[PDB]
Design a protein that fits this description.
The PDB classes it as solute-binding protein. The entry lists the keywords ABC transporter solute binding protein, EFI. The assembly is monomeric. CRYSTAL STRUCTURE OF AN ABC TRANSPORTER SOLUTE BINDING PROTEIN (IPR025997) FROM BRADYRHIZOBIUM sp. BTAi1 (BBta_2440, TARGET EFI-511490) WITH BOUND BIS-TRIS. The chain contains nine helices and 14 strands. By secondary structure, it is of the alpha/beta class. The protein has a domain of 129 residues: 3-Layer(aba) Sandwich (Rossmann fold). Strands 2-1-13-7-6-5-3-4 form an eight-stranded mixed β-sheet, sandwiched between helices. It has a four-stranded parallel β-sheet with strand order 9-8-10-11, sandwiched between helices. A two-stranded antiparallel sheet has the order 12-14. The chain is elongated. Bound molecules: chloride ion.
């Protein structure tokens, strides 16, 4: 039979949950099987995009592999904190062994998580990050690291002492936590190289908004060498580059992964983007839950090791570790 997803390159944080904990590289090894058909309640913010479809795929496939029963519910959007609270309350009242949560906000579920913990039910923090002290384990990554890996990739191509090259940087909506973290990471990582970054151009992750920013930047700086920023930005920039006759003169990068960015890399139109292996974040959360329920050793705070995908390695990575399969329909049971 064909290779399993594991062992998988990961990075764990010690002390776990510490805001200043140290990262170390480790291979993540899950259990071969669960000892019983544990019931896992899985609460998602929504099922509206490819990203959370990818997390769904990981949770469903890892639950199947281990032999456990997943019951997944989704709240319909990031406006829906109250529905996520009720859906979690309800899955616990109905009876469950552990709860895996992709939280709509960092603090908003803290009250209900505290109440669940009083019932000796493990709660796993999946992807987004929860500030509750009653979390048993985290399966997630940092957007600082996503930005940093994107920046280091470019900085290696353009080391100190080589000719200055200009990057147009389009980080997403100003002041958003994830954006400001990716920004700091990107800027820290390119420091001391021949990269010059233009002042950041923020805006909402709308296609037209980001296209207009890139247009305006190209007008102002005709010699821009790279356009880097959100996946929305990189996807929208492909057409602009084509229309302006800049293909191969300006390269595109995103600081996170989407199907559109993936196809772009495949087709030679987008140069690179990091992958957080969100499918594997889903799988690890399930493995963590099972290990806790069975009293086994587990890694308390861990994420997949972030790596940059480009033409030279995209064919070497199974898509299903970093995106949902094409055509995949969401699974709830
Ligand atoms: Cl949403």
């Amino acid at each position: 039979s064909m290779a399993e997803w594991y062992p998988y390159d990961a990075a764990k944080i010690d002390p776990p949950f510490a805001a200043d904990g140290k990262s170390s590289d480790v291979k993540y090894v899950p259990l071969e099987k669960a000892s019983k058909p544990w019931k896992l309640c899985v609460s998602f913010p929504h099922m509206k995009d490819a990203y959370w479809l990818g997390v769904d795929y990981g949770v469903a496939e890892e639950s199947k592999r281990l032999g456990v029963k997943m019951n997944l519910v989704e709240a319909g959007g990031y406006t829906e904190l109250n529905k996520q609270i009720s859906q979690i309350e309800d899955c616990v009242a109905s009876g469950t062994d552990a709860v895996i949560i992709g939280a709509i906000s960092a603090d908003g579920l803290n009250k209900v998580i505290g109440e669940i913990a009083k019932k000796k039910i493990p709660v796993i923090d999946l992807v987004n990050g929860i500030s509750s002290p009653d979390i048993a384990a985290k399966s997630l990554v940092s957007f600082y690291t996503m930005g940093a890996e994107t920046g280091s990739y470019l900085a290696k191509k353009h080391p100190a002492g080589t000719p200055e090259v200009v990057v147009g940087w389009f980080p997403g909506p100003a002041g958003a936590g994830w954006v400001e973290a990716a920004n700091k990471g990107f800027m820290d990582a390119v420091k001391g190289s021949a990269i010059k970054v233009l002042e950041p151009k923020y805006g909402d992750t709308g296609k037209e908004v980001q296209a207009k920013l890139v247009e305006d930047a190209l007008q102002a700086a005709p010699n821009i060498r790279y356009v880097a920023g959100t996946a929305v930005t990189a996807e929208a920039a492909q057409g602009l580059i084509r229309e302006r006759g800049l293909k191969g003169k300006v390269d595109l990068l995103a600081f996170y992964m989407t199907p559109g960015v993936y196809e772009g890399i495949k087709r030679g139109l987008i140069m690179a983007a990091p992958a957080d292996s969100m499918v594997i974040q889903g799988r690890i959360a399930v493995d963590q839950a099972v290990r806790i329920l069975e009293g086994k050793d587990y890694v308390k705070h861990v994420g997949p090791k972030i790596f940059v995908v480009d033409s030279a390695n995209i064919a070497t990575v199974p898509q299903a570790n970093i995106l949902p399969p094409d055509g995949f329909k969401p699974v709830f049971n």
